[PDB]
Scaffold this active site. Sequence first.
Site, PDB file in Angstrom:
ATOM      1  N   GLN A 403      13.229  24.494  35.424  1.00 42.45           N
ATOM      2  CA  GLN A 403      14.596  24.609  35.860  1.00 42.45           C
ATOM      3  C   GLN A 403      15.336  23.373  35.388  1.00 42.45           C
ATOM      4  O   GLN A 403      14.876  22.252  35.614  1.00 42.45           O
ATOM      5  CB  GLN A 403      14.694  24.744  37.388  1.00 42.45           C
ATOM      6  N   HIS A 405      19.046  22.118  35.718  1.00 37.74           N
ATOM      7  CA  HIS A 405      19.996  22.640  36.673  1.00 37.74           C
ATOM      8  C   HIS A 405      20.550  21.528  37.544  1.00 37.74           C
ATOM      9  O   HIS A 405      20.296  20.344  37.288  1.00 37.74           O
ATOM     10  CB  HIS A 405      19.311  23.739  37.538  1.00 37.74           C
ATOM     11  N   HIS A 503       5.854  25.922  47.675  1.00 34.24           N
ATOM     12  CA  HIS A 503       5.445  27.181  47.017  1.00 34.24           C
ATOM     13  C   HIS A 503       3.996  27.503  47.335  1.00 34.24           C
ATOM     14  O   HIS A 503       3.313  28.162  46.512  1.00 34.24           O
ATOM     15  CB  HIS A 503       5.639  27.069  45.486  1.00 34.24           C
ATOM     16  N   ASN A 548       8.875  30.529  40.875  1.00 30.59           N
ATOM     17  CA  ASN A 548       9.201  30.549  42.283  1.00 30.59           C
ATOM     18  C   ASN A 548       8.718  31.891  42.872  1.00 30.59           C
ATOM     19  O   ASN A 548       8.986  32.922  42.278  1.00 30.59           O
ATOM     20  CB  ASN A 548      10.714  30.404  42.549  1.00 30.59           C
TER      21      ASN A 548
HETATM   22  C1  LIG Z   1      14.968  23.757  50.001  1.00 26.79           C
HETATM   23  C2  LIG Z   1      14.168  24.983  49.593  1.00 26.79           C
HETATM   24  C3  LIG Z   1      14.389  25.535  48.333  1.00 26.79           C
HETATM   25  C4  LIG Z   1      13.712  26.753  48.015  1.00 26.79           C
HETATM   26  N1  LIG Z   1      14.087  27.410  46.893  1.00 26.79           N
HETATM   27  C5  LIG Z   1      13.391  28.513  46.532  1.00 26.79           C
HETATM   28  C6  LIG Z   1      13.831  29.261  45.342  1.00 26.79           C
HETATM   29  O1  LIG Z   1      14.832  28.942  44.687  1.00 26.79           O
HETATM   30  N2  LIG Z   1      13.107  30.363  45.017  1.00 26.79           N
HETATM   31  C7  LIG Z   1      12.045  30.850  45.795  1.00 26.79           C
HETATM   32  O2  LIG Z   1      11.384  31.824  45.393  1.00 26.79           O
HETATM   33  N3  LIG Z   1      11.628  30.144  46.847  1.00 26.79           N
HETATM   34  C8  LIG Z   1      12.329  29.033  47.242  1.00 26.79           C
HETATM   35  N4  LIG Z   1      11.952  28.372  48.415  1.00 26.79           N
HETATM   36  C9  LIG Z   1      10.897  29.010  49.226  1.00 26.79           C
HETATM   37  C10 LIG Z   1      11.359  30.201  50.029  1.00 26.79           C
HETATM   38  O3  LIG Z   1      12.465  29.815  50.840  1.00 26.79           O
HETATM   39  C11 LIG Z   1      10.221  30.791  50.777  1.00 26.79           C
HETATM   40  O4  LIG Z   1       9.262  31.237  49.863  1.00 26.79           O
HETATM   41  C12 LIG Z   1      10.653  31.999  51.590  1.00 26.79           C
HETATM   42  O5  LIG Z   1      11.746  31.719  52.510  1.00 26.79           O
HETATM   43  C13 LIG Z   1       9.484  32.551  52.401  1.00 26.79           C
HETATM   44  O6  LIG Z   1       9.918  33.670  53.134  1.00 26.79           O
HETATM   45  P1  LIG Z   1       9.114  34.151  54.430  1.00 26.79           P
HETATM   46  O7  LIG Z   1       9.962  35.176  55.053  1.00 26.79           O
HETATM   47  O8  LIG Z   1       7.707  34.516  54.072  1.00 26.79           O
HETATM   48  O9  LIG Z   1       8.952  32.814  55.325  1.00 26.79           O
HETATM   49  P2  LIG Z   1      10.030  31.783  55.940  1.00 26.79           P
HETATM   50  O10 LIG Z   1      11.328  31.839  55.207  1.00 26.79           O
HETATM   51  O11 LIG Z   1       9.314  30.544  56.112  1.00 26.79           O
HETATM   52  O12 LIG Z   1      10.336  32.439  57.356  1.00 26.79           O
HETATM   53  C14 LIG Z   1       9.311  32.455  58.310  1.00 26.79           C
HETATM   54  C15 LIG Z   1       9.912  32.589  59.696  1.00 26.79           C
HETATM   55  O13 LIG Z   1       8.924  32.738  60.661  1.00 26.79           O
HETATM   56  C16 LIG Z   1       9.238  31.998  61.790  1.00 26.79           C
HETATM   57  N5  LIG Z   1       8.056  31.655  62.563  1.00 26.79           N
HETATM   58  C17 LIG Z   1       7.148  30.786  62.162  1.00 26.79           C
HETATM   59  N6  LIG Z   1       6.145  30.777  63.070  1.00 26.79           N
HETATM   60  C18 LIG Z   1       6.461  31.718  64.015  1.00 26.79           C
HETATM   61  C19 LIG Z   1       5.822  32.088  65.208  1.00 26.79           C
HETATM   62  N7  LIG Z   1       4.627  31.645  65.607  1.00 26.79           N
HETATM   63  N8  LIG Z   1       6.451  33.004  65.958  1.00 26.79           N
HETATM   64  C20 LIG Z   1       7.611  33.493  65.620  1.00 26.79           C
HETATM   65  N9  LIG Z   1       8.267  33.170  64.482  1.00 26.79           N
HETATM   66  C21 LIG Z   1       7.684  32.250  63.708  1.00 26.79           C
HETATM   67  C22 LIG Z   1      10.138  30.911  61.327  1.00 26.79           C
HETATM   68  O14 LIG Z   1      10.993  30.388  62.310  1.00 26.79           O
HETATM   69  C23 LIG Z   1      10.799  31.489  60.120  1.00 26.79           C
HETATM   70  O15 LIG Z   1      12.143  31.716  60.300  1.00 26.79           O
HETATM   71  C24 LIG Z   1      12.723  27.289  48.862  1.00 26.79           C
HETATM   72  C25 LIG Z   1      12.500  26.711  50.090  1.00 26.79           C
HETATM   73  C26 LIG Z   1      13.255  25.581  50.487  1.00 26.79           C
HETATM   74  C27 LIG Z   1      13.132  25.115  51.923  1.00 26.79           C
HETATM   75  O1  LIG Z   2      12.526  20.909  45.701  1.00 24.54           O
HETATM   76  C1  LIG Z   2      13.461  21.930  45.298  1.00 24.54           C
HETATM   77  C2  LIG Z   2      12.784  23.102  44.676  1.00 24.54           C
HETATM   78  O2  LIG Z   2      12.212  23.814  45.801  1.00 24.54           O
HETATM   79  C3  LIG Z   2      11.462  24.973  45.439  1.00 24.54           C
HETATM   80  O3  LIG Z   2      11.018  25.551  46.648  1.00 24.54           O
HETATM   81  C4  LIG Z   2      12.405  25.944  44.797  1.00 24.54           C
HETATM   82  O4  LIG Z   2      11.778  27.123  44.426  1.00 24.54           O
HETATM   83  C5  LIG Z   2      13.009  25.294  43.555  1.00 24.54           C
HETATM   84  F1  LIG Z   2      13.961  26.203  43.009  1.00 24.54           F
HETATM   85  C6  LIG Z   2      13.732  24.010  43.942  1.00 24.54           C
HETATM   86  O5  LIG Z   2      14.261  23.371  42.779  1.00 24.54           O
END
Ligand SMILES: Cc1cc2nc3c(=O)[nH]c(=O)nc-3n(C[C@H](O)[C@H](O)[C@H](O)COP(=O)(O)OP(=O)(O)OC[C@H]3O[C@@H](n4cnc5c(N)ncnc54)[C@H](O)[C@@H]3O)c2cc1C
Ligand SMILES: OC[C@H]1O[C@@H](O)[C@H](O)[C@@H](F)[C@@H]1O
EC number: 1.1.3.10
Lengths: 573, 573, 52, 104
Positions: A403, A405, A503, A548
Amino acid sequence: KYDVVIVGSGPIGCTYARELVGAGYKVAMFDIGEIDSGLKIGAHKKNTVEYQKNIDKFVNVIQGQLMSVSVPVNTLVVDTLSPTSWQASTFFVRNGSNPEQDPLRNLSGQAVTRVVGGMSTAWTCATPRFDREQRPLLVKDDADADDAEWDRLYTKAESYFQTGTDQFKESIRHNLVLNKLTEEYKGQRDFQQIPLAATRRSPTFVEWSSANTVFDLQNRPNTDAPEERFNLFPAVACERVVRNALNSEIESLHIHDLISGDRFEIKADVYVLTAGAVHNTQLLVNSGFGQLGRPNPANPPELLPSLGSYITEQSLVFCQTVMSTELIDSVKSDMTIRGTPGELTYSVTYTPGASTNKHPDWWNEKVKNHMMQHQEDPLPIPFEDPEPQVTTLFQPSHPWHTQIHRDAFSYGAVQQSIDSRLIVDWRFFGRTEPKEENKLWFSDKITDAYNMPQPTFDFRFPAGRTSKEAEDMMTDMCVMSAKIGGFLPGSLPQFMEPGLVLHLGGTHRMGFDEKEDNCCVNTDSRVFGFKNLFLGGCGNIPTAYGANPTLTAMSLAIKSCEYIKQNFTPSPF
Amino acid sequence: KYDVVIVGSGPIGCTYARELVGAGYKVAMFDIGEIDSGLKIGAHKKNTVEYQKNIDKFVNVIQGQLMSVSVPVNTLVVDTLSPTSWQASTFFVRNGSNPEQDPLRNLSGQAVTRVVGGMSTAWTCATPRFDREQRPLLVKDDADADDAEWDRLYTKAESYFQTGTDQFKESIRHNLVLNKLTEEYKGQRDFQQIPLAATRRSPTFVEWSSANTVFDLQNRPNTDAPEERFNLFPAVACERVVRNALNSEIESLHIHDLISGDRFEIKADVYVLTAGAVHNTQLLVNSGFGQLGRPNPANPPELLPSLGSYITEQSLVFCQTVMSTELIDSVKSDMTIRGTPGELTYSVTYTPGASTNKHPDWWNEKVKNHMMQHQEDPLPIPFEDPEPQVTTLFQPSHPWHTQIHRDAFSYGAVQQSIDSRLIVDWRFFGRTEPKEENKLWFSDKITDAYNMPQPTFDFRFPAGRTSKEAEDMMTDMCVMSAKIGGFLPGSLPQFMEPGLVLHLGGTHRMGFDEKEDNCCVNTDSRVFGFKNLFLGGCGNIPTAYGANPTLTAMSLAIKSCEYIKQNFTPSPF
Amino acid sequence: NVIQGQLMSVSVPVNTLVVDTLSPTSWQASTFFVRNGSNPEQDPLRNLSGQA
Amino acid sequence: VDWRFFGRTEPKEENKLWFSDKITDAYNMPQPTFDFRFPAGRTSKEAEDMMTDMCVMSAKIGGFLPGSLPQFMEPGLVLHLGGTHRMGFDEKEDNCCVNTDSRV
Ligand SMILES: Cc1cc2nc3c(=O)[nH]c(=O)nc-3n(C[C@H](O)[C@H](O)[C@H](O)COP(=O)(O)OP(=O)(O)OC[C@H]3O[C@@H](n4cnc5c(N)ncnc54)[C@H](O)[C@@H]3O)c2cc1C
Ligand SMILES: OC[C@H]1O[C@@H](O)[C@H](O)[C@@H](F)[C@@H]1O
Ligand SMILES: Cc1cc2nc3c(=O)[nH]c(=O)nc-3n(C[C@H](O)[C@H](O)[C@H](O)COP(=O)(O)OP(=O)(O)OC[C@H]3O[C@@H](n4cnc5c(N)ncnc54)[C@H](O)[C@@H]3O)c2cc1C
Ligand SMILES: OC[C@H]1O[C@@H](O)[C@H](O)[C@@H](F)[C@@H]1O
Ligand SMILES: OC[C@H]1O[C@@H](O)[C@H](O)[C@@H](F)[C@@H]1O
């Protein structure tokens, strides 16, 4: 009693909700966190006018909701306290540290978010597909059929996230970088816009996607969906799924309501765990799957012996650059300039349609107007020009995602001396071989802030291909970035803390056969042996991937929901 | 058309809404920011289970919503760029910097928040009353009557905020500090809990107050208020109030809807500006009050000549300490200890009701149980013990406000090596004499992110009493803190950046007579000469004050609303 | 600089700082072993670290 | 202007300089090792009273310079170590190594 219970309101739980609510199931979703994004529940927190006018502030939002998974006992020496101040004579367990954790075998950067919408309230929205080399099989021994299935699923996932590849097409900065890289690697590598789950609303505002885009999280029935049934219950910690004695079915979900303090049982036909790659694993281990406590091969688990093993996390290298003089000069190559800025006679003109010109007329108009209207500014790039969003996707000859960006997750103090229009981020992401010895495990004595077994990592990047590629990746970033500009002091080429990248995969990994493929769930994301328990998320992905992962996880979730729709009947309404 | 329009949804705008909505006026409120606190609109963002389990993370929320007011042109030299990187040959205006601003006469720490609920979504909730010496007069030449009026108004304001002085009474840490200071200054100074706008819900959760507590910001009519009329319009920049030619009445409010991009006019009977001490002033200057541009005494304003002059900001000194050995030992003074921790025979006991004992039985029970249940921990203070919340209020012999506490606004990297139970913050706040030469002014050429005249400060702490007291205050903090422990490395005694404290006053100051008292509004907060324009907020406070100002501003707002209720008739419903 | 160039620390305890941003290819020990002239006898919490 | 205030430390038997029987220094001599804490009691109380005195006295001249705020320095930076081979009249009664002629 519900037809389907979903644990977690991130984008993967919301995929399950979208599919199953729409198919007429009575659905409950529980999240340990609370509503945090305004009236659009689970929406992207960057979608405010104020953040998009002050984007360098959004790092604070990200940091404020990332809670470290496992922090080793601190051993820093402070020997400048006053003699009167209390001090212990040892480095005792304090400030929430995990005495189980070896500081030298951690993913210190790993963190979790507990908020409605999960990490999608803050994410970058990059949604590339995996190529074959990174991707688990869904069809065996028929690569073309496997390709076709992934195409179908990814196409649907891209519709749910509103992924596109053109939202930045009018950026000068973006095109400047894209075109230079395309020219320099003429032929050898292909560059494109990063695929982004986002919809541009104006030249200065992008509506970034989130869980809310997948499913709006409003309770149903409601006026716009009068025959649908969904309830979201925030501030509810899910603690355990109860197995029947046969280990063939889950019979209830044990919950803890964090506001009233009370504990309850919830009954459903189908249980879906989408709590993230760490917390899915924690919930399962707390429920009798895998093995609680420090790993011990003299006591092998009765259920899901590969749970929490073969974990993968990507290596991440980062730098920033300052655009080269040659590139900046090229922006204004079609201009004729007469006079000196600030004088009566100053004139910046272009001959529109001259095809000695390098750029389209729209570009030249932006530049001309910036130069004429802001004569005290020395750069030809307009002030509100959007950021670059460039990638060359993973290929066998460069087996990393890239990336090029501007990310809102900055890693150091944001510098103010160099004009922001000059700055480009570089993030290269490596793939990590799954190895049995790389583990997420949970303590049998130490508990986390929610009184659940404390997560502990035993992780090192594998020797061999993983490590060699990681260092080749670093070199590739150094060589490629140099075609755009030199490094920015304070953002020199570096590996980031292990797991900062967020990740993490493979904690509850997918495969065709539990024993042969060392796995926990089948290709329908169903836990082996259990009729009615499904896991969603990155924890399912069993391969070494650099791109990602979220779009791939969502695609698996879509397939899982097809199985559910075909095998469980919605209750009458 | 509305009866009353309110600009801003902070706690002062919400005071006006509470009073006027309840009195039956048709009210509209506009805020340039957006809904950001979950389903309780305008509520405190710290009121989540997750933040109160991870309080050291809340600093990120604060930083993510504080946008600097005026940033001077940067002149840092970076001379380690690659030769290929572009660079300008001057320190040109870049990255949103304000070329009007003298870096040596700024309030560099001043910042604003643009979110529904304003700064009350993040504040510390400290709500002391001002004593006579800090407080503007409301009644002239009758100090007892003045006292009585302020008592009436503050009592009501304290009810609206849910101020109390007992929420921390069960904290060991709190009482340890409180009692030691009371003993050391036996008689000379009095210590008490900081008055806090908060309601404890459990031993581990406090519902901190906010704008939402004052007024819940839900549109009305609704089921619980079926005869009330209120609408909140977020993402609406208010830009100008339109004066009639007589300069006796405001005829409309010009707004810019930030989502649709459209500009409109809004008509009301009464106009209330509660946009904060900076933005009230900006709106007024953009409307033809005071003087636009760099101050110029050869062009004196036609209206409100004291607008933006006599500004006050408090000096702030800070440190942290590490609790003394003597104090820590005193926690466990009533205990008999036998054996060594971790052995079979270890015993920590107290004789309950022995009045050789120093502490109540509840304290001793907490300590005993912590010591017996956590034998690997070397401290006698329970892990979930709440923070200190201690003050000695401003007096003539110590003319500063003090807080001896733990604030969520940390100023440096949070240290991890010293146990958090040992740490106490010290913040002493000085009063600043109002001086005509201290000014907030707005550029006639430079604009901010919302295309409004750029704010610029011309400020220095006055010579004389202000400066002498500030340095006496620093010394007082050094002497007082030493009775509790030595300084914590990394949080040594220091003055904070001017305006970080965010207690700016006097920008649209109150008094009895416009000319004699160099003021903008009367004691009803009515702008002189105008029938139907009122200003609320800290900008009204014309005195040198050290205590936290919001409760005093709210009290003035209550008085202002009495005038409105007595002079304007609600439309029929 | 003259002063610093001729003051040699008397007793330096074993270092336990975590550096976890090394490249995967770089060698690392699995413990905080005695290195760079450090004194494994020395309790870091009962030292005169400034003595030289 | 710099401010440096220097406190006095009670001699205590438990505060020791000792030398390793296994570890050697750069000149192949027994490695020095400290077992030191500032004594509780008068030493510690005075040290903190000293800090306060510096804060009060310095304020009569000017405010602190950012980056050189009031602080305790690392133990022994001061380089005023004493008592390692201490003087007295009587070896046993005065717990000492040399007499008033500095003779062992
Ligand atoms: C700053 C940042 C940048 C990112 N950028 C990217 C990107 O550009 N591309 C990409 O592919 N990925 C990216 N990621 C990763 C991506 O956000 C995650 O892969 C994705 O949100 C995972 O989805 P999920 O629904 O499996 O889990 P999560 O989004 O982690 O959601 C899990 C949920 O479960 C809940 N939970 C946890 N434990 C319990 C429990 N015991 N009981 C009830 N609820 C619970 C939480 O509160 C949460 O809301 C990024 C992450 C961050 C933080
Ligand atoms: O640390 C930021 C990075 O976090 C990762 O979780 C995202 O997938 C990337 F897009 C992003 O640049
Ligand atoms: C971290 C922190 C800690 C604090 N702690 C304390 C404390 O403990 N005690 C205390 O007394 N004070 C404290 N303060 C200060 C306190 O929060 C403010 O005094 C108080 O919120 C001011 O209330 P207000 O309604 O006048 O203005 P604000 O709360 O600033 O609200 C003004 C509103 O107007 C809006 N607005 C601005 N311009 C426009 C425009 N042109 N059009 C439309 N809307 C506009 C904003 O979006 C905003 O929401 C703290 C502040 C912070 C940030
Ligand atoms: O900087 C934090 C300080 O901010 C001020 O605005 C508050 O009034 C104080 F209570 C708080 O300690
Ligand atoms: O650290 C410097 C100090 O070193 C001490 O050894 C000297 O005696 C002092 F004079 C000097 O200020």
